[PDB]
Design an enzyme around this catalytic site. Structure first.
Site, PDB file in Angstrom:
ATOM      1  N   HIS A 105       0.849  -1.229   0.000  1.00 12.02           N
ATOM      2  CA  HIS A 105       0.000   0.000   0.000  1.00 12.02           C
ATOM      3  C   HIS A 105       0.850   1.231   0.000  1.00 12.02           C
ATOM      4  CE1 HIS A 105      -2.375  -3.160   2.239  1.00 12.02           C
ATOM      5  NE2 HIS A 105      -3.125  -2.873   1.190  1.00 12.02           N
TER       6      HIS A 105
ATOM      7  N   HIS B  90       5.758   7.014   6.558  1.00 12.35           N
ATOM      8  CA  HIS B  90       5.411   6.593   5.218  1.00 12.35           C
ATOM      9  C   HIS B  90       4.871   7.792   4.482  1.00 12.35           C
ATOM     10  CE1 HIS B  90       1.673   6.177   7.478  1.00 12.35           C
ATOM     11  NE2 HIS B  90       1.101   6.609   6.368  1.00 12.35           N
TER      12      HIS B  90
ATOM     13  N   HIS C 284       2.077   9.143   1.139  1.00 15.92           N
ATOM     14  CA  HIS C 284       0.986   8.955   0.191  1.00 15.92           C
ATOM     15  C   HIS C 284       1.264   9.902  -0.986  1.00 15.92           C
ATOM     16  CE1 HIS C 284      -1.651   7.023   3.307  1.00 15.92           C
ATOM     17  NE2 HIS C 284      -0.882   7.748   4.125  1.00 15.92           N
TER      18      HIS C 284
ATOM     19  N   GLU D  46      -3.281  13.703   1.004  1.00 13.72           N
ATOM     20  CA  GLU D  46      -4.592  13.248   1.646  1.00 13.72           C
ATOM     21  C   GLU D  46      -5.235  14.483   2.223  1.00 13.72           C
ATOM     22  OE1 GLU D  46      -3.390   9.731   3.906  1.00 13.72           O
ATOM     23  OE2 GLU D  46      -4.368   8.793   2.229  1.00 13.72           O
TER      24      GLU D  46
ATOM     25  N   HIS E 295       3.680  11.029   6.540  1.00  8.00           N
ATOM     26  CA  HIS E 295       3.063  10.766   7.853  1.00  8.00           C
ATOM     27  C   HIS E 295       4.098  10.181   8.718  1.00  8.00           C
ATOM     28  CE1 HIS E 295      -1.221  10.477   5.932  1.00  8.00           C
ATOM     29  NE2 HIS E 295      -0.769  11.717   6.084  1.00  8.00           N
TER      30      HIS E 295
ATOM     31  N   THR F 203      -5.759   7.032   7.789  1.00  9.19           N
ATOM     32  CA  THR F 203      -6.367   7.280   6.443  1.00  9.19           C
ATOM     33  C   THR F 203      -6.351   5.969   5.653  1.00  9.19           C
ATOM     34  OG1 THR F 203      -4.268   7.765   5.505  1.00  9.19           O
ATOM     35  CG2 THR F 203      -5.456   9.558   6.593  1.00  9.19           C
TER      36      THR F 203
HETATM   37  C1  LIG Z   1      -0.410   2.659  10.152  1.00  5.55           C
HETATM   38  C2  LIG Z   1      -0.782   4.004  10.097  1.00  5.55           C
HETATM   39  C3  LIG Z   1      -0.628   4.810  11.206  1.00  5.55           C
HETATM   40  C4  LIG Z   1      -1.006   6.165  11.141  1.00  5.55           C
HETATM   41  C5  LIG Z   1      -1.521   6.669   9.981  1.00  5.55           C
HETATM   42  O1  LIG Z   1      -1.902   7.983   9.869  1.00  5.55           O
HETATM   43  C6  LIG Z   1      -1.682   5.875   8.858  1.00  5.55           C
HETATM   44  S1  LIG Z   1      -2.372   6.583   7.326  1.00  5.55           S
HETATM   45  C7  LIG Z   1      -1.318   4.544   8.903  1.00  5.55           C
HETATM   46 ZN   LIG Z   2      -0.668   7.606   6.148  1.00  2.00          ZN
END
Ligand SMILES: Cc1ccc(O)c(S)c1
Ligand SMILES: [Zn+2]
Length: 257
Positions: free
Chosen positions: A61, A91, A93, A103, A116, A195
């Site tokens: 993802h 990570h 997006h 997002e 994030h 999200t």
């Molecule tokens: C695993 C995870 C933790 C926090 C987040 O905002 C998101 S999008 C995914």
């Molecule tokens: Zn995220």
């Protein structure tokens, strides 16, 4: 199972994760004119000097850069937060095109990507117990625009070809997440959720006003990753963003005038 395509994308997630239509879902559009300045917000404290990265993982993802969260290192506190939150992973997006990817949006503007940095409230002992609580997580969200390269991002971009497909990981030690931060820590904050499924409503969102700039070549390399596993038809990892959700009964607060 869930993803970002026509048949398993955001419009579908509510069937396995009914909290998708809950009362504090993320992301949201940040209407800058109606986000009120809150002079009781304490300043934000990001202390990443002892951060210990371990590994980078393509989870099918996005990719996660994971940290050793077994000790008191890499913490976020202050701002809207009570207590101390420990960094576990970050990570991104991003989009198939520079015109989309983020997002959160700011007065409906979409940035090319969003970072994030995920942290868990140490009063709950670990991440898994923290995502059972309404104040379990704090996520620092940082927008990316395309322009000048971000030198501190390059070590991530250069490792991606080793984790092309779903389930691949690579050692990723000694990465310093301070190199991903803009100059200013001015932010907006509101209560929200992950999200991505499971969409848990655990998150105090802290979205920085100042984007970082990344180069077109850096983002193009994110778009060469794959959602599929090795040996499967190639589906480029692009457009792994959920669109903005209803604000419902929430206020977004600004740390700045
Ligand atoms: C695993 C995870 C933790 C926090 C987040 O905002 C998101 S999008 C995914
Ligand atoms: Zn995220």
């Amino acid at each position: 199972h869930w993803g970002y395509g026509k048949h398993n994308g955001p419009e579908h997630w509510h069937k396995d994760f009914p909290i998708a239509k809950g009362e504090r879902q993320s992301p949201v559009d940040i209407d800058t004119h109606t986000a009120k300045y809150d002079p009781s917000l304490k300043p934000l404290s990001v202390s990443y000097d002892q951060a210990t990265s371990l590994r980078i993982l393509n989870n099918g993802h996005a990719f996660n850069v994971e940290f050793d969260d077994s000790q008191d290192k890499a913490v976020l506190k202050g701002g809207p937060l009570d207590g101390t939150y420990r960094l576990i992973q970050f990570h991104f997006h991003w989009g198939s095109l520079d015109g989309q990817g983020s997002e959160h949006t700011v007065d409906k503007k979409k940035y090319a990507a969003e970072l994030h940095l995920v942290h868990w409230n140490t009063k709950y002992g670990d991440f898994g117990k923290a995502v059972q609580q309404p104040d379990g997580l704090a996520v620092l969200g940082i927008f990316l625009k395309v322009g000048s390269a971000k030198p501190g991002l390059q070590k991530v971009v250069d490792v991606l070809d080793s984790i092309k497909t779903k389930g691949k990981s690579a050692d990723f030690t000694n990465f310093d997440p301070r190199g991903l931060l803009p100059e200013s820590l001015d932010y907006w904050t509101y209560p929200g959720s992950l999200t991505t499924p499971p969409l848990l409503e655990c998150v105090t969102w802290i979205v920085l006003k100042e984007p970082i700039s990344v180069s077109s070549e850096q983002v193009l390399k994110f778009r060469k990753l794959n959602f599929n596993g090795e040996g499967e038809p190639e589906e480029l990892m692009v457009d792994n963003w959920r669109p903005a959700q209803p604000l419902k009964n929430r206020q977004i607060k600004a740390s700045f005038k």
